[PDB]
Design a binder for this molecule. Sequence first.
Ligand SMILES: Cc1ccc2cc1[C@@H](C)N1Cc3cc(ccc3OS1(=O)=O)OCCOCCn1nnc3c(C)c(ccc31)[C@H]2CC(=O)O
Length: 288
Amino acid sequence: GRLIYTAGGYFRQSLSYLEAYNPSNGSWLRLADLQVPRSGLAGCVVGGLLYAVGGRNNSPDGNTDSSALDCYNPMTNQWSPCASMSVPRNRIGVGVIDGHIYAVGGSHGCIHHSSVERYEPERDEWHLVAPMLTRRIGVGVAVLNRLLYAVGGFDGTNRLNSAECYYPERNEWRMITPMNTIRSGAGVCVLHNCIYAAGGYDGQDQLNSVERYDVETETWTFVAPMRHHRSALGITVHQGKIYVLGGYDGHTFLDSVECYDPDSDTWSEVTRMTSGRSGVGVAVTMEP
Ligand SMILES: Cc1ccc2cc1[C@@H](C)N1Cc3cc(ccc3OS1(=O)=O)OCCOCCn1nnc3c(C)c(ccc31)[C@H]2CC(=O)O
């Protein structure tokens, strides 16, 4: 894996862009568009292939929540459809455990899901697993030590500071320590032994604060805030650093890409996306 891929997003309407950033030389490549423009989707990688999951096609012709799973192969620069999920999931969170994709929460119209389902690429099948204890849309999801975490979000009435963990061998969800901040549409990732929650929306403001959950201590601690307040940001980890892409700051759909170095506890601007956007799906895989 060597490029940071950003798929979809929103700027005036849902986007079909697939673009890839090379941290080693600062270059951006524009690759094959998604077959359907989608915002509020998630991206992930299994076996070197990039998957785009869920989202919504917000267009002048009609708004449709997506149950789609599409696969991009960097060796061919082509997207291929996969089996669709049981239900549409806009503002979804996804995590990968042992080659399986877990699709978590998200919305279908006014329905805010607590349901979760798992995709097996070798069978091209989805199956429902135990639902979360809380309905969550705009939920951040990360995997640490083969355990799946669902962080923050919106339950249909309130934005959440709560978080929960899924234990696959017990098919059970249990609440973990809540975050110090309410966050919906935060960027959630894993770095070292911690789950980071960056930015998001608390129901009033877009946030620049960043906190991390240490799974051995069960505590959330704030780290250095980002240079920009961002909600509905893309996030990924590459070579021990967190990269945040775009998002909305309450005024502009950002093109800013910042990088967090955990050793210095500093955020730096590293590049700008080709255009400002929010609600993207991000993941790292081999160059095309
Ligand atoms: C992916 C995603 C996750 C979480 C949220 C929204 C979205 C969707 C709707 N994206 C964010 C977005 C934002 C936008 C237009 C399109 C758009 O499309 S998108 O990029 O796919 O305009 C923002 C105008 O400010 C409203 C206040 N605000 N700021 N951040 C917000 C967020 C994060 C949510 C809700 C309201 C938010 C939350 C939902 C909530 O808490 O209710």
